[PDB]
């Protein structure tokens, strides 16, 4: 929970919540038309967050991956996994150690907007990089 | 257009003679593990050796092939194919080649090595071929 940290996290972009500190990115900015390879750009832009987070020595991320509830429930859980186990790998390389990273593939069971719409539904498909404040 | 200087690189490379030209074989299973078209690591790196070796010896266009088994949605499975033989070429963009110089194919399920009657063989047609062309 330390207090130094916040303002690297938040000039890291991460705003606040009630289990800690979450940042957001959509799974078209980070994939594009990928199914899970990160575009290189985006790849940057995390591995520079991982090494600044990293930097401040935080003990944990937790990276949430998220679809809409459009298509098949279990394939949009298990791709969820997936992006969320492609933002993790930006993590380790940049050098967080495994035991310091937890993977969740919510699916499409945690959205943010309403799918009626197909711009909630592309507002649901993303990734979330959570710090925990315990 | 051609050279024996060429060959050498692409021999340690692993690389091995085909029609019209040399080619390079490896298996989703390594290239990807568990992942969709994301390369796992250590095999990124292992092409990245690859492409910066042919680079050097100034290897004037690659074509990159991806293939599936014949199991699930054949419209899906040729995008995953396509994917995953991108997934190989951006490595290459990232070695120093130009996006010119790379050509990019997904063949589904058509173009099949091994049976796909058997797990192992369904396991071997899902597979990226980099291949080097003779002209």
Redesign the interface.
Same mark, same amino acid.
């Given at each position: 929970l330390s207090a130094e940290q916040i303002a690297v996290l938040q000039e890291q972009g991460f705003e606040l919540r009630d289990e800690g500190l979450e940042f957001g990115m959509s799974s078209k900015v980070l994939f594009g &038309? &990928? @199914?899970? #390879? @990160?575009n290189?750009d985006s790849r940057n832009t995390l591995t520079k967050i991982a090494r600044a987070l990293l930097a401040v020595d935080i003990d944990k991320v937790r990276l949430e991956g998220h679809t809409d509830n459009y298509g098949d429930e279990g394939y949009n859980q298990k @791709?969820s996994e #997936?992006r969320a !186990?492609?933002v993790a790998?930006v993590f #380790? !390389?940049a050098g967080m150690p495994a035991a310091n990273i937890e993977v969740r593939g919510l699916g499409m069971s945690k959205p943010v907007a309403d799918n009626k719409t197909r711009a909630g539904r592309s507002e649901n498909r993303r990734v979330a990089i959570i710090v925990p404040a315990e």
């Open positions: &038309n &990928n @199914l899970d #390879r @990160l290189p @791709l #997936r !186990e492609s790998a #380790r !390389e």
